[PDB]
Structures are given as C-alpha cells and as structure tokens.
Design a protein around this nucleic acid. Structure first.
Ligand SMILES: [Cl-]
Ligand SMILES: [Cl-]
Ligand SMILES: [Cl-]
Ligand SMILES: [Mg+2]
Ligand SMILES: [Mg+2]
Ligand SMILES: [Rb+]
Ligand SMILES: [Rb+]
Ligand SMILES: [Rb+]
Length: 135
RNA sequence: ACAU
DNA sequence: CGATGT
C-alpha cells in the first residue's frame, strides 16, 4: 500500500541474459548509491537479483541497521527466503564466477541470522525501483 | 498467469 | 523479438 521510504532498494543490471551482470543498492528515500558490485562476465538476471538482496542483508547487518530491503524480483525474494538459488544456468568454466558468488551467498545465509524484512517493490503502482539501471 |  | 524464473 505505502512505500516504506526508510529502506534499501536493490536491482540488477545486465548486458544480455545470460550476460554481463552487475547490481547496486540505493537509499530508497534519496537514491544515494550505497553499494555496487563489479560486473560479472556471465550470469543471469535472477542470480544478480539474488546476490543484490544477500549483499543488502550483509551490508545492513554490518551497520546494525534494521531497515527493510526492497526488490522487484519475485524469484530472488523467494530464493532468499528458501536460502537456495534455483538457477538453471549451466555450471561450467565461464559461469564459475557467478556460481561461486551464488554458492558463497547461500553459505552466508546458512550461517548467519537476520530480521531484515525483504519486501516486494510494487512496480505496477510505484514505477521503477529506485536502484534501477534505466537500461 | 505472475514477477523480472 | 530473446531469456530467466515461480
Ligand atoms: Cl555477490
Ligand atoms: Cl518492514
Ligand atoms: Cl515476492
Ligand atoms: Mg529488478
Ligand atoms: Mg531494473
Ligand atoms: Rb552486527
Ligand atoms: Rb533497466
Ligand atoms: Rb516466460
């Protein structure tokens, strides 16, 4: 119903899907960029959306912040809830980096606690998420 | 169908 | 138009 402005918003950007994947997190209220992942040569949209949420969890935990995280990705929200990224991307030499990051993200979720609410950004009502790449 |  | 996902 109402945007929770006191929050972190995350999003993926890609060149191809699968293709080059990056992600960032912004302060929902101001658009200030709070973190940005160096581009990963091959990944999927959903792997990037997942990594962005997990990085947000880690970022807020390190800072003792109870703010929620917004993502527009139904898939990634579910993967984080399950602590399992059910990607179809082939595991081979050229996808090794993205899969290492995804594996490490799951490992972190399995060994740490958090209360951060992970909320669906309602694009149809609110427009593009504030972390969007505009591409 | 919905979300990207 | 293609691809990633529930
Ligand atoms: Cl990552
Ligand atoms: Cl909340
Ligand atoms: Cl959701
Ligand atoms: Mg998105
Ligand atoms: Mg976007
Ligand atoms: Rb902490
Ligand atoms: Rb975009
Ligand atoms: Rb589809």
């Amino acid at each position: 119903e109402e945007i929770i402005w006191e929050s972190l918003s995350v999003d993926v950007g890609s060149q191809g899907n699968p293709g080059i994947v990056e992600y960032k997190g912004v302060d929902t209220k101001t658009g200030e960029v709070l973190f940005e992942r160096e581009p990963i040569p091959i990944g999927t949209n959903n792997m990037g959306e997942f990594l962005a949420i997990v990085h947000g969890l880690r970022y807020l935990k390190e800072r003792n912040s109870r703010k929620p995280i917004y993502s527009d990705s139904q898939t990634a929200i579910k993967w984080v809830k399950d602590k399992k990224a059910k990607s179809t991307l082939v595991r081979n030499e050229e996808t090794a980096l993205i899969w290492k990051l995804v594996d490490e993200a799951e490992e972190w979720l399995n060994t740490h606690t958090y209360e951060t609410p992970i909320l669906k950004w309602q694009t149809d009502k609110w427009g593009e998420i504030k972390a969007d790449y505009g591409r």
